[PDB]
Amino acid sequence: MRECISIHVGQAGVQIGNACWELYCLEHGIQPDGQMPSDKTIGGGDDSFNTFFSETGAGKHVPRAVFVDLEPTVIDEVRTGTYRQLFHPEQLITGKEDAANNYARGHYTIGKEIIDLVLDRIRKLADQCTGLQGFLVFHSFGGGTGSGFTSLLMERLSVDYGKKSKLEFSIYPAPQVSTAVVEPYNSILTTHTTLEHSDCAFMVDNEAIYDICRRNLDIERPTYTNLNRLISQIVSSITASLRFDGALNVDLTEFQTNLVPYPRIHFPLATYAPVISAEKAYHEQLSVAEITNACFEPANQMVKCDPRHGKYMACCLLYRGDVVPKDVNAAIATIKTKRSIQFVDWCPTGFKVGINYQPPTVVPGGDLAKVQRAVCMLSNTTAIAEAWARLDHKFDLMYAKRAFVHWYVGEGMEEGEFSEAREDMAALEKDYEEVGV
Amino acid sequence: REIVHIQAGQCGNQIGAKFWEVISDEHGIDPTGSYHGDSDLQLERINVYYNEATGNKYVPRAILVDLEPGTMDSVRSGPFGQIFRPDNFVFGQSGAGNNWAKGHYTEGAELVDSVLDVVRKESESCDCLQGFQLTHSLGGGTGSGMGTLLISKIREEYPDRIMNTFSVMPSPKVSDTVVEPYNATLSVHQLVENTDETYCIDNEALYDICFRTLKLTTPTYGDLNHLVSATMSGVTTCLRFPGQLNADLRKLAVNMVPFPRLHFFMPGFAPLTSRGSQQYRALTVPELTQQMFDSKNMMAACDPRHGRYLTVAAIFRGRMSMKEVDEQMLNVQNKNSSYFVEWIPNNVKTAVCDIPPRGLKMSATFIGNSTAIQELFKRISEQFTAMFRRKAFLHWYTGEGMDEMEFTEAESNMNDLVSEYQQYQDA
Amino acid sequence: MEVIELNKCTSGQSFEVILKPPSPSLEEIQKKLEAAEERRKYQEAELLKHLAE
Amino acid sequence: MYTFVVRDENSSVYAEVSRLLLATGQWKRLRKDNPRFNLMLGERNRLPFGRLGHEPGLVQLVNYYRGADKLCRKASLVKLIKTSPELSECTWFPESYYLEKPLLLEPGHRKFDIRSWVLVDHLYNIYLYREGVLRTSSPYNSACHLTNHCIQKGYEEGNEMFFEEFNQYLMDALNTTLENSILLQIKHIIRSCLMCIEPAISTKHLHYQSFQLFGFDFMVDEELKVWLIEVNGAPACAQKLYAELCQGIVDVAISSVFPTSIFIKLHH
């Protein structure tokens, strides 16, 4: 058993971190006080869930997590919330002045004042690990903290934990729910500076999560709570192999191996099915074939894009619930005839499959119906580069006039870091194009 | 994140007092500082504007300033006049005679340090000061001349805090003296350099609204200040209340100001109402949206169709469909896309708060950074040169030590501001 | 269509299906983080010196 | 009022379509780069499909099907026909990697090809415009071979025989009709080509929607037997038919999304 430390940065990362840890406790039978009646090894153990929870001598299961924000408002809700007793106070780190939606303020001015404190609180968790696997980092592209402090932290983690894997859960910016006009600036800046320090990054476009909540959950105007419960179901699908017994994606290195054959193209697309409203009184339960087919419909992807016009380098299917291999292969055979699934020539045309018999857990009172079977598909398709195209365009419109650059330069950043970050993104879009035509 | 409020001169103190009356009522503080409120949205962020005292008394973080005692006396006699901390009354005795030079260079200099001592005491007891908010007119002497002197010194001592102003622009239709264009031009030159955001509250626009829309045949400063306080309450909503967008002065500056000097905002409000007469049909969200963008609802007397919106911030107050608010705001931009610069994607952002202002079931407040604001500054530039070309009324200013050259720089800086706004109207 | 690598356990099983085969240092960080703080300090020194004028 | 932007200023077809849209008083043209459009008449190459359908509050539509280039480029088409099982390795495509006895109009002993305009709407209806055109060649000789309008550079005005005269000819000369002897084959060929790529290019569950106008070029042989030569993805019309076809493109493809018939619906 090797441990994983989760790091949640800024408002998005913290609030999404709370959703995930609430769900993790429900799936593992850990109550809000941290007690786990099913752990018969009191005070310790090298069970799978210990990848994410340490145990106290008093039988408490404590997340291997640190929450970090440059302002106290959001993490204060964790300090007073239903799962407050779960986290040691040292894991909840707060500043006084947030980043003001400004990457440069999070990375340079305010970031440099708190980085050393965060890395020591992190060192405190690493030191309780018998073998540290690496980190799961949750954050927005758009916030000043989520983008600016995260990239500063990712650089230091590479220095202080060179041999250790770093994975990302990144909230891509959408206007329906955005907070700032400069989110395109912060996205490119944080992507450029972080790209080399991240082994695998699961992007979630708030536009996709938002429409799924409107279309499938009948939520007229989804809030952050609606989005985060749906997002945390998906993150739980992605991390279930690290917390449960199995043979697929059992450590962080397997995520690179299985999903990222080429280092810079390391943003797998996540597609999730089925999403069913708790309000539907009568629901006809979906077969393996129906939920698997739904993994190829763009309306269920965490990022809207068209994989038919891209190429696959890797593809995994993560099922939870009443699923057996025969139905999956049957489902795949018929889906393969009817769909445009092109793999790059230097990769086998295949699907790595993982099945967990525990059907998805749903938050009591949430919007998600309990279902008999569900699947999360992780595919590395060049089609996701459409999201980079969208973002780089928005960046280009503002940067051509240098609109708002003075707020970044005023914090100590240099104008040339903008164009330098933009050039990296130009190289990235070019990489996806070579790999996909 | 504490805000420090400063109100200077006659206009500054009068609209300052109204602002504190109106938001106190919104937060459930009575004139004696006691909270008698219903909701807990009212106290969540109450420390942004109020200080805590024994007996759970809430005291405004406000400093009252004037070179003239008379108006501060009237404030102390006003409804909420006893809520202000008495040591925060800072006043002289000679007045400024509607003279920017007396406020900025001679009379105001005598008093400015005492004011800075009070500012310092308030700052030294803040967890994290966001910055400052000043209410003042630009057409008199104290708010205009001493107000801008205060801004210059506050910036020197707090160079990393946000400076925000509510600046009442002079109009010949509501005019105390002929030298208002002189005082306003000298001040605009200061504001361009030393504030991060200023709301252009135009007495011409407030007059036209009272006369044409509200049908008030002879508008008073009371009728003007009703509009100003509705605007001031609206635009600060996202600073005072918890919501999906928890805003502060720096986040407002960052998202509204693409280039440092272009930080002069057109405020808008709907529904427009006159004091005392309440109307009983609430507006529909489509009505709020259309009226709030209508030129007849702007407080800065500029036709928005004569320019482009760089950025827009809107806030809807009351119980209503956020879906309908989103669709209606999306509708106005898609139907009028030519009036929003294409080079700032998604430059319109909307917030919603459940508490409505007193007397309204639903309101919409509008904050525009439009290149049409240049019309305001040209108007003032024309009035200035009409007198300045004959050096008329200058002796009032040379008498205090000022040189003509200073007037030339200020006028030329304001003409530069106009050119810069014209630069982006076409891009 | 070939199935491979099948692993079963009491929690689930995993496996593979092939349809068709193929065909900076801590000091460098300290340097730039401090270069930025000097540009900030410099620009603030121009502000205060201009305000001193 | 709906809004549209124009990004290919060399399309005769959509120049006339812009003209028609404005004159309804219900469409306003935005600037090329304004993104707040309902409709994009897009550029012919590198059209930015990845930036469509992410405009909240806007239903977006575009006059091209991403992926239809496979049909519409010489070497892609042969690749598509040979490899797709729906079009076997197929009785109506000339072997690929000359048609030595074409049908020849009399008088003139001339050679020709038939262009058919086909409009595929966002719902993937296939609409064959009823007006075709033959391109004549002012005398065919083994050992006036390429019927291209420009190459031939005058029988029938501009070297174009429309379907009424051509049908009259088939009755007089050959004792048959344009419908029975050729058009069944053409409707079959069009239907097969577009049903083949429908899963690759359809926009039925997509965040943006597409329609597109195609030009199918056919060659009739001496047995009254039809062959597919080329599929053109950015075709132009004949001056006589511009008005009707462009008006049809608005009724079927544009007003249908943003609110007797000159098209034949090819049911599939």
Ligand SMILES: Nc1nc2c(ncn2[C@@H]2O[C@H](COP(=O)(O)OP(=O)(O)OP(=O)(O)O)[C@@H](O)[C@H]2O)c(=O)[nH]1
């Ligand atoms: N899915 C999801 N996205 C969120 C959530 N909270 C914030 N975001 C996104 O994050 C973006 C802004 O970044 P934030 O994380 O909120 O800002 P921050 O990380 O706290 O950094 P600061 O600028 O200092 O506040 C917005 O565009 C939101 O779309 C959340 O709870 N769930």
Ligand SMILES: Nc1ncnc2c1ncn2[C@@H]1O[C@H](COP(=O)(O)OP(=O)(O)CP(=O)(O)O)[C@@H](O)[C@H]1O
């Ligand atoms: N296999 C074949 N047998 C007989 N004639 C043929 C033929 N292939 C082509 N042709 C004739 O020769 C011409 C060669 O021109 P080509 O087909 O390259 O033009 P095009 O169809 O690209 C022009 P446009 O795009 O304007 O329609 C054809 O238009 C047709 O008249």
Ligand SMILES: Nc1nc2c(ncn2[C@@H]2O[C@H](COP(=O)(O)OP(=O)(O)O)[C@@H](O)[C@H]2O)c(=O)[nH]1
């Ligand atoms: N809207 C409004 N404007 C005012 C009020 N009082 C003064 N003004 C304006 O302010 C200008 C006079 O400046 P004033 O503030 O009275 O001089 P000061 O005492 O030195 O600050 C005039 O042009 C008025 O239009 C008021 O109560 N409301």
Ligand SMILES: COc1ccc(N(C)c2nc(Cl)nc3sccc23)cc1
């Ligand atoms: C151009 O995009 C913008 C404009 C403004 C903001 N912010 C920070 C606001 N701040 C305050 Cl105090 N009130 C309001 S009301 C709507 C926004 C808003 C955010 C993005």
Ligand SMILES: [Ca+2]
């Ligand atoms: Ca154990």
Ligand SMILES: [Mg+2]
């Ligand atoms: Mg935050």
Ligand SMILES: [Mg+2]
């Ligand atoms: Mg006066």
